[PDB]
């Protein structure tokens, strides 16, 4: 069907199984002193994390104070200059002998592809943390400073009123 | 190879986010009538803590199951209103998820 069937073990665990789970896990721990499914109550025991700390799904694999970059910068600049130079040479190829133009085209793309690699090491979450950091920091400083400004102006008004009433005495 | 129970339970949890899946599951009588399914739903609650929460793909179902948790004391009735209510309350629920995680 369109919707896959519920998992099979879901139907094994009734309320009686839930209430008898404590004694079952106590007995299992006492006896113990891929997990084989010898009893229907085994699944409620929390599954163990794989030792390799890896998870595979759909053909793809998955697994501290914030809780020479100049070399990369100059590499990027020289790569951009070489990319412009190669673009000029490739368009010249198109001009004179376009029949073999593709011979350079993908080459240029490789440099562009390398640029993407040069982005990968530069990857930005810390920079986003920084920018959010300063925006809420400056917002709270603005709120604070307007608080002492308003309380100070109220105090100044109170002192002026006190002087006015003392003069009228 | 045969996938482990981790993979199937995680995929079930992430598929629970679909409104069509929830509507289909609640359409059948014996799914809600059987206490086994709700027992499994309450068993699934323990994935809201790390490091299990680091392995999720769509955080919305995190509330949905919790919303489904509410369904055990709110009633089936309300199945018809489920798509409308999720569409209407998507903004504030996404905001509260962001507050729970992004802050």
């Amino acid at each position: 069907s369109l919707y896959p069937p519920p998992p099979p073990y879901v139907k094994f665990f009734t309320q009686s199984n839930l209430e008898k789970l404590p004694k079952y896990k106590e007995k299992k721990a006492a006896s113990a002193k891929e997990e084989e499914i010898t009893c229907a109550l085994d699944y409620l025991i929390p599954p163990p994390m794989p030792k390799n700390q890896q998870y595979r799904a759909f053909g793809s694999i998955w697994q501290e104070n914030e809780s020479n970059y100049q070399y990369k910068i100059q590499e990027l600049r020289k790569l951009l200059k070489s990319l412009l130079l190669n673009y000029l040479e490739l368009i010249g190829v198109l001009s004179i002998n376009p029949d073999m133009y593709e011979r350079k085209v993908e080459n240029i793309r490789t440099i562009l592809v390398n640029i993407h690699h040069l982005l990968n090491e530069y990857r930005q979450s810390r920079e986003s943390l920084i920018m959010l950091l300063e925006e809420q920091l400056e917002y709270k400083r603005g709120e604070i400073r307007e608080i002492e400004q308003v309380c100070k102006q109220v105090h100044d008004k109170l002192t002026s009123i006190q002087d006015t009433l003392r003069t009228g005495s | 190879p045969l996938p482990t129970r981790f993979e199937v339970e995680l995929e079930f949890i992430q598929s629970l986010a679909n409104i069509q899946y929830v509507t289909y599951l609640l359409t059948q009588q014996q799914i809600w009538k059987s206490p086994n399914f709700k027992n499994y739903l309450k068993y699934l609650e323990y994935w809201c803590n790390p490091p299990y929460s680091q392995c999720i793909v769509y955080p919305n179902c995190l509330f949905i199951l919790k919303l489904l948790n509410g369904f055990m004391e709110s009633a089936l009735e309300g199945l018809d209103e489920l798509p409308k209510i999720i569409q209407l309350q998507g903004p504030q629920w996404m905001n509260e998820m962001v507050e729970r995680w992004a802050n």
């Binding site: 069907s1 369109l2 | 509507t23 199945l79 798509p83």
Partner: peptide, 25 residues
């Protein structure tokens, strides 16, 4: 003429009961 028209009694909240099954290829 027409004494009174009918009030709109639409029920979009109705979930419908369309059977879906031939999705797998």
């Amino acid at each position: 003429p027409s004494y009174s028209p009918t009030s709109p009694s639409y029920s979009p909240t109705s979930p419908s009961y369309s059977p879906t099954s031939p999705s797998y290829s």
